[PDB]
Amino acid sequence: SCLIPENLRNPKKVHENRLPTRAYYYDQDIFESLNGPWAFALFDAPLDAPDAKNLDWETAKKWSTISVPSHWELQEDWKYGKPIYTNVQYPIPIDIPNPPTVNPTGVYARTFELDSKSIES
Amino acid sequence: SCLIPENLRNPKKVHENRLPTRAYYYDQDIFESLNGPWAFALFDAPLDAPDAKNLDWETAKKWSTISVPSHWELQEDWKYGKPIYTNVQYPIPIDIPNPPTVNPTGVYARTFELDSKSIESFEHRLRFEGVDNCYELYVNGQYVGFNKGSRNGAEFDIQKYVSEGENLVVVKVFKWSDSTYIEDQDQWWLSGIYRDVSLLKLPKKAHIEDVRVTTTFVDSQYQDAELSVKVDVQGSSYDHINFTLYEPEDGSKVYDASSLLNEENGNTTFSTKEFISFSTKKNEETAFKINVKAPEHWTAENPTLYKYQLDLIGSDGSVIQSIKHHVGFRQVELKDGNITVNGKDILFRGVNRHDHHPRFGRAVPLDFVVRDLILMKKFNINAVRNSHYPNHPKVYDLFDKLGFWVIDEADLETHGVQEPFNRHTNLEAEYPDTKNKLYDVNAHYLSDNPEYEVAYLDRASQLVLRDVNHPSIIIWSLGNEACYGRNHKAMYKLIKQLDPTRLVHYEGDLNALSADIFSFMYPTFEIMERWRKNHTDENGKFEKPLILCEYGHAMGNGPGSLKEYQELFYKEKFYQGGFIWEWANHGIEFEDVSTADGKLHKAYAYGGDFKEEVHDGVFIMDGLCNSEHNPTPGLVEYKKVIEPVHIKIAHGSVTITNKHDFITTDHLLFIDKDTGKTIDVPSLKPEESVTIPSDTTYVVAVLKDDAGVLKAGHEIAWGQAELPLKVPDFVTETAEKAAKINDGKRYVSVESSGLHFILDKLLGKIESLKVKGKEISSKFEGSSITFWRPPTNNDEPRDFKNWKKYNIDLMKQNIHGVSVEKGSNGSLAVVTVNSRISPVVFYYGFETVQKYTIFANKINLNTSMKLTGEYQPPDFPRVGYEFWLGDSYESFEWLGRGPGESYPDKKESQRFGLYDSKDVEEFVYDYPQENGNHTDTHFLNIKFEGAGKLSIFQKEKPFNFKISDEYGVDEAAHACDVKRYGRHYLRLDHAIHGVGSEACGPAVLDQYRLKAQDFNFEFDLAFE
Amino acid sequence: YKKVIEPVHIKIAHGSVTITNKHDFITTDHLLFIDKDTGKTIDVPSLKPEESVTIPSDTTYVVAVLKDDAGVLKAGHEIAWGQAELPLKVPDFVTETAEKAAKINDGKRYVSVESSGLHFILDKLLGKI
């Protein structure tokens, strides 16, 4: 299935380059929040989303913003769709391990500042 | 119970002071109509109604008026309530024999004038043709009597009560009574004086009270017959009776509404073509038996009648009274196990006909009844069952004159006793061979209840004695779905005593312990066949035959498989046909708020529309004709399956078989439709056939001359040679044209001279296909191949439940790969789409390959659908493409079945030919559902303005198609609720599920079910 | 046509109902006059052809209706009616004039105005919403 990206239909692709899980401790001196408004655009499926290897901030600057954290089905005026409630039944067809081809894809973008000392320290 | 009057809760109080039932004859000189506006008031219950012994005309004058006849639930602005529809369930609590305490009571009042001479010259009676549910009657403030039996008549002697000058008639009518329990027909509950009221003036000193006419053949060869005329004369002052029989008028006699309904007259000379004359002598029996030399037979196929005049004569030799009626020479017997008329084992080509009019209800104008019967005759029907009560008494001459085998049925249904039982035991299904054991449980309440015997006998006595003299009536029926009990046995004994000349029917009596006939309703072929075999002995003899008093439930799109029932009827002498249920939808006209429009529109009401507490919804709409009593595709199909002549064309031969019971084919003109010249067909007797060598494809059997209510040229039967599927001679442009192929990230373009093809690769959707000015695109919601149809009434109870359960309405196309290559053998390009078509929630679905081979003037679409996965549905409604048609679209034309719609098990009436959409009024169902499909389609041409046609054909097999405008059909309650797009679509189908009759009867038969399986099919979209 | 030829005139102005009989022969006796604002009936004197009466009233809408079934007409059938003229009243709609942040995007061809619960797009080339 070349109309569905390989990583969305591979049960073994649990992650790529994720660090090993460790015990959680919040530390104010280490943690720096990136919450707030992010550039955001929603696409019908992966193939409509831009290549992120070529996405400028100059390009993404022009998008509407969404606030992190939040679900995109819970925005002012249901802008990016509405919630779906199912109990037992899957809301998709069962064709393990394939997701549906039409697969809502949201691209988030924001920037942050880094010091000369920061990268060294 | 002193809050309920005694007579409304006494099963034995069938009437008070009603005269004995006599044979009905309308006489203009005796009958004086009291129809018109009456003073009327409605009261909550009997105790609020005035005492009629004290009601002045001066008081009643001040009330509003209502017009007689009419139901009071059918008035301007629903002034006195609305109709209630229940099928089985009683609309009251069951507390036999009590009616509800709150019991709508309508008091009618009017006056009439009486002369000094009138009271001296005449005996005065009041005759009420029908009042629902029951009533007490008052004249000049004096109680006359009481009556029960809504569809029966009643006469009361009024002589004691009348004065010179003004006379006051007051009728107190009650909605409910102990009688309600036996009046539970599946129909509208409607009240009031809904039939004619008359003042009868009979000659005082002597008059004819009753007449009995019988015709018995003397011989086993049915030639000479004994005519027996017995007269009951009341009074002393007469000398004798005269009788004149006139020369017969052949059943081929031409009638219309006007001549059928002409009621004249006093000075009108009945006839003068004398045949036999008889006189009685002074002081001798006013009866006689005459031998009649080889008379013309009365038959439903040829309703030949001898008019007669019976005269009562005084001492001075003057005529005191005349009866002008007719004799039909006919004998019905149970002979060698068959219902026999004149020695012939007949076949019922029948319907059940209720009294119904979309505005007046059960108060049907005779004009409208005539309309019904003409239509029946126009559609090859030869019999009617009076479901489930006698009609207006004037209707029976109509049967006599037009020719129908009639089952006249007692006004008695008890069905509702079963409803609490059905619900308590969670009963899913009843079967004709076993269901009697279920009814046996509750028979004790009414049909096996001694308290009701008097009532049950009265229904029988009233039925038989009013209509005894109509040759059209061959069978009396004890009622309908009333269980089985001693009361039925009592009815049977009485009817045989009263009238030995006819046979008795009662379907509730499975083993016909007190009936002469076996009867099933909605049986399966297997069930019919079990019964046949268990009642035919080793020698091949059966004691009694089988009819289907109800079958082929005609509700909505359907009934399917009328063909298979018919094949069975013709194969076994033991089966003698059936009566389909029903003649017409019971829809009542009303103002509906539109779900499409937000505006008010005329519609036809079924259960729920009048906001009943309890109702049975759309089961009102179960006719071959719609609520306006016009033919549906059901009636069109029925006419074809029952056609009384078979025409088979094969191997350069036309075989014609006469399938009438009595008549020859002489009245028929056979036309070779391929040439237009007529075919010389030998005079064929019943069951005779002939093979004639011919190159013909299509032969029609047509009426030579106006006869009965049918016109010269009217089609009776037809046949066609089967038509091989021929590929049209379309020339595909395989010349090499330069073509630009643009395979983008999401969209693929193929552009050439005169051609534009765009496909959305993500969806599998055709965004646009424009070839030579003609444009289509996929009507897309989830999938490019769809499966759903708006469920028919038949689909609802089971198939729909399955289709919904398996989410067939939510089938999705998930694209896996799209392949784009340059054209090969004359081809411009090949676009191949690989996908899975599967609904949300589920595993099952189709591994699908759609190959689009694009030529300059044609698009070949190959579809391959591989059924995969666990937990599959049994069947689908449908399978195929949906396309939006361009703005240019104006009309279509097809080679296939037409002119109307057709479905796998409902198609044969729709002959092959070339059809144009412009020539066809597409059928509008009273209840919106699957419609407009055309099956066995060879090719389809879609015409676009200014750009010619797009031709569409499926390879190697005929296909299915629908072209329409409409949506929201599933949830639209009425025709006016149907939504419409701003453009048309084509539903292009490889296959479609059959239609059946499962709303009440067998499921779609196996060979017509669209079973779950792989689908492979190829279409061409050829552009002119 | 039924309205312009109505055989009774009902005029409502200045707290008064004026009723004029416009029949050629018959009286108004067969008619029931209902104050539609209250539902209670109005006592109207028997008026001969061309006779009229002014009755003080706060009513807006008066109907003249048949008392009893007569001829081919039913009790309650409307013969004539009148209304006081109705001033144009602005509905009591509350316009939200509170300050909401709004994004205005004035593009080359299209202009967008977006706010909470609101979306307005105009094609500047066409003048089309």
Ligand SMILES: [Mn+3]
């Ligand atoms: Mn509706």
